[PDB]
RNA sequence: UCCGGCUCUACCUGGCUGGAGGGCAGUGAGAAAAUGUUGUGGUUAGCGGAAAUGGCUUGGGAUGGCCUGCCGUAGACGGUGAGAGCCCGGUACGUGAAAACCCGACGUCUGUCUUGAUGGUGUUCCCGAGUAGCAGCGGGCCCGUGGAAUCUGCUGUGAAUCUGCCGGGACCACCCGGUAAGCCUGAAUACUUCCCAGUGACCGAUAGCGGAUUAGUACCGUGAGGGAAUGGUGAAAAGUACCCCGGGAGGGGAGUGAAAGAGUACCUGAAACCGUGCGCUUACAAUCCGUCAGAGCCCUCGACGUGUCGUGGGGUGAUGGCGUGCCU
RNA sequence: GGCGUCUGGGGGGAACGCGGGGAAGUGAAACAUCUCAGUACCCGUAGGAAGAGAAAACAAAAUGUGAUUCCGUGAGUAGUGG
């Protein structure tokens, strides 16, 4: 059981969250986390690579000269692989790279990852990043300076709280996310993780039932 | 293009960094302008040819429009909604240049 | 709902033919044309748009390094004389349409039910005809003629209307479901000649579309039809003014340029291949062309001493022995 | 049939569709039935999508379903087959 203190931009604390024990005391399985991130990246990767084999190229559909009497070798098309202009043989093709990793392996990855960060005290919470309804990236940057010094960081802000997203978007390191599409690559690439409290509550009362 | 013939400019990059100059012609289709006193080249012309020292074109992103107050300043665009013009305007003062 | 006249006819009723308030619906598949308002509704041009001539050094040029500041609903991208958030173009964001076009929105305009319906009750009539069905040849249905239904094509024959008819894998009786042979019907679905905007663990000039270069061109063929090759100066042409040799090409000086080991045959500039010099060796010798020993000469590093061996190293290498190319 | 007038159609298209026609090399270690494939190709007509489409249907005594089409499964199964 790990406790977190919410934090405010104006220089105060509101309250404390008492995180679960089973989500955030999982022991990581490095092979599991490896497999899953590899799958994510593979499904990201698009298969725009195609080549024209011997049967799609232009021409070649006439035996260019005799079989015998000539002196030279035997040839059946002017577009075969050994020519210069000829067909690719076993080329790239447009294909899919997704692979079907299961729900339990995925979630085990995510819980183990959040545990790896929590044990090392890199999960910070916060009510908000901003004052009312006017984005200003200088605010959020100063607040993250208060709360953090590392290069890179993750931010979990919901959908409705658009101002925090619009604010912190432009920063160099930051990589913002909604907790409905919470994943593993984006967690592990970071060093610190900033949850909103609404986000934590949603995550927890969505998983726990 | 934020430069027109007749304007005055300050050179940024080149050996002639720190030069005032008057624009003579522009070449907007390729963003280059022939400023006076800068980019001096010893062209050979044979006739009765001769080694003659002529201008050559800056690229327009190596000159800042000199402010009306005599300092290198950016330029921007208000509207005089009555007359419907879009005046080129410095971003230190706001004046007409 | 009121009446106008009509039920051949004046009179009581039942039933029509008109108009009227009304309702319903409408460019619907269910009838069809145009109308005028009309929405910051959309498309067809675009526009503004934050913040460093910052300091030292390098360098031809700073967009580099180091040190100082700033913007950020904008650190996507590209270019600019070398990796540029603060130079430029533009992005986040907000703006913008006289006219035409598309969406609905309306009011016109058009019909349309309104003269009406809910139920009762015992029997005649109708319920899509050369068709359904059966036989003969055939197609396709998981089904290749098999016991082979259903769906069907050509010929030949050819029925009834509700105790009717067709199906429930031959067929028959019972039960079940359904009511053919008249017609329309959106949405989910498939596709990209063209157009617009982007992405890439795709190529990067023998690759990638055949086509980065005049490319379906040149060239070939009578003809259908085949079907190629060639990208890069440099930051900007400042593309060598002038002189000398030469008929001219081409070159040497002088110059430009950061560099002409960048000269319009030009980034770099391999090998094969073609030659010029320097050292060794080779014209009494039988050589898969090398390898092991090695004389002699030439170069070099080092300890020393008037030149000299060495835990040396490298090029050639007289002469001797051994030795029958590579792959399938 | 002839004469006059009025409105239509006529051809091109990259794929996609529906109706019709319609092979062969291949596999079967030969081969004709079969398969390749009702594919390629050819024809006639379209549309922005098409065609099908309102039960003379399924089902099994369960008191069931309720136009059609396209996707997943049933299923490489029940079966068919020199």
- Which positions of strand C lie within 7 Å of protein CB atoms? 47-53, 60-63, 71-76, 79-81, 84, 87-89, 92, 199-202, 206-211, 216, 226-229, 236-242, 255-257
The resolution, in angstroms to one decimal, equals: 3.4
A135: nt with nearest C1' to CA: C73
Q: Which residues pair with A3 in a beta bridge?
A: A18
In order, the DSSP letters of B41-78 are EEEEETTTTEEEEE--PEEGGGEEEBPTTSSB--EEE-
User: Edge-to-edge, what's the strand order for the sheet holding A153-156?
Assistant: A123-126, A192-196, A153-156, A175-177
Neighbours of B43 (CB within 10 A): 12
What Å value separates CA A142 and C1' C271? 63
Cα atoms in the 13 Å half-sphere on the side-chain side of B41 = 10
Q: Measuring CA to CA, which residue among A170, A95, A157 is closest to residue A128?
A: A157
B73: nt with nearest C1' to CA: C53
A43: nt with nearest C1' to CA: C201
Give the span between the Cα atoms of A3 and A20, in whole angstroms. Answer: 9
Count the helix, strand and coil residues of chain A and give each as a percent rounded to the nearest 5.
35, 10, 55
What Å value separates CA A53 and C1' C227? 20
CA trace torsion A199, A113, A190, A131 (10° rounding)? 10
Give the span between the Cα atoms of B13 and A74, in whole angstroms. Answer: 64
Determination technique for this entry: cryo-EM
B54: nt with nearest C1' to CA: C238
Tokens representing residue A10 in the block: 């104006």
Q: Measuring CA to CA, which residue among A156, A136, A144 is closest to residue A200?
A: A156
Domain boundary assignment for chain B: 1-97
Give the span between the Cα atoms of B65 and B15, in whole angstroms. Answer: 19
């Amino acid at each position: 059981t790990l406790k977190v203190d919410v934090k405010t931009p104006a220089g105060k604390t509101d309250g404390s969250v008492e995180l679960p024990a089973e989500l955030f005391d999982v022991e990581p399985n490095i092979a599991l986390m490896h497999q899953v991130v590899t799958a994510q990246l593979a499904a990201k990767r698009q298969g725009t690579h195609s080549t024209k084999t011997r049967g799609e190229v232009s021409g070649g559909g006439k035996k260019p000269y005799r079989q015998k009497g000539t002196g030279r070798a035997r040839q059946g098309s002017t577009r075969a692989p050994q020519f210069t202009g000829g067909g690719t043989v076993h080329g790239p093709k447009p294909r899919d790279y997704s692979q079907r990793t299961p729900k339990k392996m995925i979630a085990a990855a995510l819980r183990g990852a959040l545990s790896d960060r929590a044990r090392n005290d890199r999960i910070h919470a916060v009510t908000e990043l901003v004052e009312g309804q006017t984005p200003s990236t200088k605010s959020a940057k100063t607040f993250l300076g208060t709360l953090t010094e590392n290069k890179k960081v993750l931010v979990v802000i919901g959908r409705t709280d658009e101002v925090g997203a619009k604010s912190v978007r432009n920063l160099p390191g930051v990589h913002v996310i909604s907790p409905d599409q919470l994943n593993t690559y984006d967690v592990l690439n970071a060093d610190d993780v900033v949850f909103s409290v609404e986000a934590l509550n949603a995550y927890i009362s969505a998983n726990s039932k | 293009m934020k430069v027109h013939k007749g304007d005055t400019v300050l050179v940024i990059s080149g050996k002639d960094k720190g030069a005032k100059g008057k624009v003579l012609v522009a070449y907007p289709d390729r963003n280059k302008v022939l400023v006076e006193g800068v980019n001096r080249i010893k062209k050979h012309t044979a006739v009765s040819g001769g080694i003659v020292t002529q201008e050559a074109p800056i690229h327009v992103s190596n000159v800042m429009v000199v402010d009306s107050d005599g300092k290198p300043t950016r330029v921007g665009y208000r509207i005089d909604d009555e007359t419907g013009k879009k005046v080129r305007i410095a971003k230190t003062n706001g004046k007409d240049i």
